[PDB]
Amino acid sequence: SKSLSPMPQIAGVTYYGDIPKQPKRVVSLASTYTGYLKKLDMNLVGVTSYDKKNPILAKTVKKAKQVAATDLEAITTLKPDLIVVGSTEENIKQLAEIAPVISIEYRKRDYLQVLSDFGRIFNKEGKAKKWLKDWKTKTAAYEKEVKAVTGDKATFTIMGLYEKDVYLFGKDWGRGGEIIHQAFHYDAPEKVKTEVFKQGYLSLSQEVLPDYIGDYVVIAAEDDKTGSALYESKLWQSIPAVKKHHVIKVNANVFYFTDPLSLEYQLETLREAILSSEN
């Protein structure tokens, strides 16, 4: 049998079976976590559709098969020694019959803690610590670069276009919020702090958008055509941030994510976009 993880008790983490310390064949069924596992040098043999559509992550998991959580046959034949899932997955019991499962309830640990937590689970503390120390220094330095341009108290709102809907996001639901609010310590407008932050996200009617945007807005979308009718509208064009050219449009295919690999890309992209807003 496998050498075992110490399986620490961590908020949000549930273990099904004996988790290996050094898994050799991991199936990741939760896009939140795939890039954390890659950062810690795990061999991923299965990943999700969102993972494959994230160009930053996809480059690192070319040999992994795309699978869904219902793919019991394909997952079995991948011969995993570990499966990682989100806690809301429909069929964790069936997955745990195939291999040991780590199930994570989102948001119980923050985007940085998740990495050091995996460091404890897999005895990869050094790799996690090195990344986290560098991240702390780099983000503080970049925070200075961007606030030099905007002012330290400029407000930012995180937004996404999805289907025909409009979402706002807080500090810990992807779409750039970790970078903008946690890494750069930008404030959000009061209405976003009150109505969005605790909730994580808020699906909004388009006509009230002006009320939620202050100095800057970051907008994630999967395709560059989705926002067209909104963007040309008098409503949108009346927003001071829009008039100032403080709209930052980003590609959701990577910006949905919160993992170290995706966030490295988001960090550089957002730094450059803020600087570019004053070109």
Ligand X SMILES: O=C1CCC(=O)N(O)C/C=C/CCNC(=O)CCC(=O)N(O)CCCCCNC(=O)CCC(=O)N(O)CCCCCN1
Check: CB of residue 71 under 8 Å from CB of residue 27.
no
Q: Contact letters (x/-) for ligand X, 8-37, by CB under 6 A?
A: -----------------------xx-----
Q: Which residues pair with 13 in a beta bridge?
A: 104
| Binding residues among 256-275 for ligand X as defined by CB under 6 A | 256-258
Q: Is 163 annotated as a binding residue?
A: no
Using the minimum distance from each CB to ligand X, give the nearer residue, 32 or 103. 32
Q: Is 224 helix (H, G, I), strand (E, B) or coil?
A: coil
Q: Which does 182 bind (CB under 5 to 8 A by kind): Zn ion, ligand X, Na ion, none?
A: Na ion
Q: What angle do CA 57, 58, 59 make, to 5 degrees?
A: 90
Check: CB of residue 192 under 8 Å from CB of residue 170.
yes
State the amino acid at position 112 in one-letter form: L
Q: Locate all alpha helices (DSSP H) within the chain, ordered by sequence.
A: 34-39, 49-53, 55-58, 72-77, 92-96, 113-121, 125-150, 177, 190-192, 228-232, 234-237, 240-243, 252-255, 260-276
Q: Contact letters (x/-) for ligand X, 194-213, by CB under 6 A?
A: -------x------------
Say if strands 26-28 and 82-86 run parallel, antiparallel, or are unpaired. parallel
We find the least distance from the C-beta atom of residue 56 to Zn ion, in angstroms, to be: 25
Q: Is 222 annotated as a binding residue?
A: yes
Using the minimum distance from each CB to Na ion, give the nearer residue, 182 or 226. 182
Using the minimum distance from each CB to ligand X, give the nearer residue, 64 or 246. 64
Q: How many CB atoms lie within 10 A of CB 223?
A: 10
Using the minimum distance from each CB to Na ion, give the nearer residue, 22 or 113. 113
We find the least distance from the C-beta atom of residue 243 to ligand X, in angstroms, to be: 28
Residues in the interface with ligand X (CB under 6 A) total 14
Q: Is 135 in the site for ligand X (CB under 6 A)?
A: no
Q: Where do contacts with Zn ion occur on this chain (CB under 5 A)?
A: 185, 244
Q: Where do contacts with ligand X occur on this chain (CB under 6 A)?
A: 31-32, 50, 86, 88, 106, 162, 167, 173-174, 201, 256-258
